[PDB]
Amino acid sequence: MLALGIEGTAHTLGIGIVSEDKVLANVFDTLTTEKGGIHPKEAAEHHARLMKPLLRKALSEAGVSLDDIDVIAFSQGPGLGPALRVVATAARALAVKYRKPIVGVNHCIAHVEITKMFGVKDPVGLYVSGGNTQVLALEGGRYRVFGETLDIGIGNAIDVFARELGLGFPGGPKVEKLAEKGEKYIELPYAVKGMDLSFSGLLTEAIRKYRSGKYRVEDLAYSFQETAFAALVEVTERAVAHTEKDEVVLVGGVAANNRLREMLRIMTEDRGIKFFVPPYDLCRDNGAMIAYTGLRMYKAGISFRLEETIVKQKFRTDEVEIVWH
Amino acid sequence: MLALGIEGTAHTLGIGIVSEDKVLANVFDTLTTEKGGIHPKEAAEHHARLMKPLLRKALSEAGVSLDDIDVIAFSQGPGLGPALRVVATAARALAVKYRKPIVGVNHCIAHVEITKMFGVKDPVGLYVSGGNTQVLALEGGRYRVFGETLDIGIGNAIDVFARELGLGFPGGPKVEKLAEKGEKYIELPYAVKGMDLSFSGLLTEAIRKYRSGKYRVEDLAYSFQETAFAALVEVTERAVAHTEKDEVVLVGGVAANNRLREMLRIMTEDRGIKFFVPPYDLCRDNGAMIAYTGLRMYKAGISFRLEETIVKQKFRTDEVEIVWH
Amino acid sequence: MLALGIEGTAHTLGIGIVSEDKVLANVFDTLTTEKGGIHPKEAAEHHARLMKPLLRKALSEAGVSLDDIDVIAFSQGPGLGPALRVVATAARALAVKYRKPIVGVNHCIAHVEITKMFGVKDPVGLYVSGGNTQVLALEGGRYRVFGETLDIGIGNAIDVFARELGLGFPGGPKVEKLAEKGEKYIELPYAVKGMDLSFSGLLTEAIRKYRSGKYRVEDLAYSFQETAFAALVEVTERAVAHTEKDEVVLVGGVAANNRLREMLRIMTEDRGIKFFVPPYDLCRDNGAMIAYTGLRMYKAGISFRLEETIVKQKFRTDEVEIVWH
Amino acid sequence: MLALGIEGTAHTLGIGIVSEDKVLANVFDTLTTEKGGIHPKEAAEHHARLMKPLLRKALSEAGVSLDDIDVIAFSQGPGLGPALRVVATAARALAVKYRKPIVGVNHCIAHVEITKMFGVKDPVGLYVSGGNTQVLALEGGRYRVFGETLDIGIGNAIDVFARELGLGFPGGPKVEKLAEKGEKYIELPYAVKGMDLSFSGLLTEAIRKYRSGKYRVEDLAYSFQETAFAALVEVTERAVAHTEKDEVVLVGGVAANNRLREMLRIMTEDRGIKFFVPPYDLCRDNGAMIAYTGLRMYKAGISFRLEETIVKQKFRTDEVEIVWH
């Protein structure tokens, strides 16, 4: 069986083709802005322009046509509405034209499920992107949230901090570079709030201490990361200990960060359990993860009626029953 | 319609008879324990000997007969194997003898659900008994667990501490009374471990400092209570903040404690939300909670097959699809 | 905090002690009436003689003293003058002797409000007792009356009918039992007159047809009940439809009747809304309902001056600004 | 004291100047459409164009200037938002320019209160306009609703019926003309639903029987009115009987209708109580009623802060506390 997956919850439009065991195609195009941040109306146009090229390109790279495709899958949410609607219309178009089944896929679940194409069985998952930050795990038939940002994503937080320091886009690796040179740990607001995560307090304080001049730049970068990431490890560890699972996965654009990986590996080694990060192309926002989850769903008898394919800008992870596990 | 409910997960055998909106009968008999603590065999013997008398008493106060009953509900778990087995045999026997359908009820869920009989819509529930301690709330089709004891129930901890102080059964109210006179906090191990609760460390330390003769009992009683209850409140508050639920309920045998009630009201009042405790007889282990949940289940179409009524000594709260909410 | 509440609007003297979430004590003593019916003087004598014993009993079960009480609440009206006067004198005396603030409580409001102690948010309430029959609900800062008896309470009507049939006190349950065997509706005067209720016409007609010897008692009992209760349901349903409130509560001595409960569940179930009846002891005239409302009032800053505690034999439900909701 | 009142909840823009006892000015301009019905965006423009002329004209007819005006009052709601906002901006403009007090006035209350300038003390009021239909009375400190349309106003209902019959705008008096010639009463759906009014069922049936050809036109007109008006009388009578008030007033554009007046007078005479209809210029939508209610409010110490003058498109009558009665 083959599945076509279209992803566009955010800036990236991604089209991907997979079967059960292998990825046949995985093609990308992220919206590049000079100023950064979220622009929902621009991405929608972006996704509409690139729909035909990437779609034509993915089918080619896999050496297949739409009649070989068994199911069409799309990122239903969560995310920016105008982009979700572009994705959904194109997906609905194809199901009507080729009379193929169509499934609505949860972006967040897709991020964790893709690891299961790589011999990971039942992990606690840490999803960290620009605007998403979530520790999730399968418990009682659904992917439950064990901790999430109450405001801004870790990725976006590292961006604001970078532009404040004058650093050039992309902010991610630039703050990571500096961090590796810092040698004084300066105290900053803790990012764990009850069960969840908060980066707003931490972010604005880190900026206030930067503006004071009293500290070395590298030292603040080091501290800003450590605190943010220590919080991510703690919530992840809380989940591991609670669920008694023996695998941890790290996913999302921010999985790039080596210091993050490192801290999670330290934690996973103490407890003596598996730590897996998928290849970067199935880590960042991509269509293959959508196609893959989409395919499992379909193989388990899930097929959406048109009425059921409305976009869900605020899609909760615990809304989808995981009948295919 | 009517439902008959049998509770016997521990030392209480409870028999209740309830309709959708009234409790027709709620009767009790408890095994006496001189030394205190858990005794699986004697409990099963207790329940066996008391089944017929208590059932006769129930039907009497309810002023009804087994023919008027529409469904038979029993506490399927979690609890002490041998006592569960006596409850399930008694419930199965009734089911055949009077050609009545049967439902197996989760003891913890029942404790929370019973509050819905009188108005509560969708609570975060703190269940605290002898050996149980859980914060649980409905989310994604199931009652999920937000924090629980990793070792011993708060009830049994307070009881060990009381037996240590040479206090006459029952421990709770006596320790509660000494705590009111306390005017100095003496530091003891925090009882929050990650997401969950732990009371062993706290209990052994509290005992150690008692034996030193260095401190006033009242200070130690107050310090034991403040540490343990603050733990309970924090875990509850964590769930409240995360689920954004606008009501908290306090259930279990340990709900008798006014200091815990007070600490919870402060937490709920500061958040501008509501706090409820069901009447004492519906709060402690009882058959009416089993009957009420049983009845809600049956009306939603849940009716057990005999092999589905195998006891579940370690029944997980999240195993049950709450299809009747 | 604690509140002590005295009820004595009719033949029951009720004394309750309640905190915000538990009923510490709920005690009763009722004047015996051979012939049945209303006797203002003997009731005032009853309440005078029983005040001290019942108060002593209450403080005992509650396990507290008058010094631990924060506020004294009493049933100010509506009810029988001489009995109200005994209640208010007793409550005023306590207020000075123990330097406690005092609140006057509306008996009908209390009946509804008590359901809020255990979870009910904003009901349409049907209050049905001996001489009271009202549909009332919170709207525009007050409990407004949507329909009420123009003559006699449903309780007393059922009782007159029972004494007529030569039935041994109490009437309600006996007429209820005969009604269950009824299989023919015999037409009787509709009890809805405009917005309000009327039971005289119905009662005299039912008596007339009984005396004719032409009909089975069971048919007449059933017909009396169906006519009167259908009236009650319609007026309640009218308020439900108009206020668009999503919960109905049934309170008063007459709530014991299962046929009325059933008829109300049908009405509430067809509208997809909720129906509750408080436990029996909080349903009938009692002191705990007075205490609970009293306490909610005091916490909102209502504290009476002595001249504000003049009895109100004809206390209107809408006189009270419900500032504590 | 003098008050300026601006009215524009609907099609009419009305400016009026009153003192306590007399109306100094009362000027109008209703939006005239050929097709009828509600057009919110057009009326807003209408009200903005006519603001200056009518305002200039009213001040002239009263022989006064804005510095003589003590308070500015405006129809805050209920009604069509875009028109309400035009009214409110102009009102806010003047309070800021002349630093005079400003009150927000309820259109519906204003309709009933104006009668009190004419020696009516405490009436049950029937407000019938195009889109409003409400029986209201002062009870427990507020104007409470005793019955209201659940769909369309009686005025608008008589309009749809008129255009279906081909009759020329205004539909009101034309259907009244025909009605007076009908002599067969044809059965049509009753317009009382529980506590309230519904004209939709009745309206569409009346049309279906017109389209059948089986009946005389005049006879349907007679019946359509009788049924609609019989319903209005019944709800009004229900209120009278319940509140025990001895005055009834009839207000709104539809007060024009003589048959309506007549039916209400028949009812008011049987019960032997006062029936008053104010002069047509204070009956239909006008500013003088706004100014008058506005003035009483002010005299009783009500003065709005700017924050409190937001338009209320869905203003409930029982939201305004009547502290000036």
From Swiss-Prot, chains A, B, C, D:
GO terms for biological process: tRNA threonylcarbamoyladenosine modification. Its EC number is 2.3.1.234. Keywords: Acyltransferase, Cytoplasm, Iron, Metal-binding, Transferase, tRNA processing. It is found in: Cytoplasm. Substrate binds at Y127, V128, S129, G130, G131, D159, G172, E176, N257. InterPro entries: ATPase_NBD, Gcp-like_dom, KAE1/TsaD, Kae1_archaea_euk, Peptidase_M22_CS. One of its GO terms (cellular component) is EKC/KEOPS complex. GO terms for molecular function: iron ion binding; N(6)-L-threonylcarbamoyladenine synthase activity; single-stranded RNA binding; tRNA binding. Binds 1 Fe(2+) ion per subunit. The keyword Cytoplasm applies. It comes from the Archaea. Changing Y127F: Loss of iron, but no change in DNA-binding. Its cofactor is Fe(2+). It catalyses: L-threonylcarbamoyladenylate + adenosine(37) in tRNA = N(6)-L-threonylcarbamoyladenosine(37) in tRNA + AMP + H(+). The ATP binding pocket identified in the crystal structure would actually engage the substrate TC-AMP. Belongs to the KAE1 / TsaD family. Required for the formation of a threonylcarbamoyl group on adenosine at position 37 (t(6)A37) in tRNAs that read codons beginning with adenine. Is a component of the KEOPS complex that is probably involved in the transfer of the threonylcarbamoyl moiety of threonylcarbamoyl-AMP (TC-AMP) to the N6 group of A37. Kae1 likely plays a direct catalytic role in this reaction, but requires other protein(s) of the complex to fulfill this activity. In vitro, binds tRNA, ssRNA, both single- and double-stranded DNA, and exhibits a low ATPase activity. NCBIfam families: arch_KAE1 (TIGR03722), gcp_kae1 (TIGR00329), PRK09605.1 (NF007174). This is tRNA N6-adenosine threonylcarbamoyltransferase.
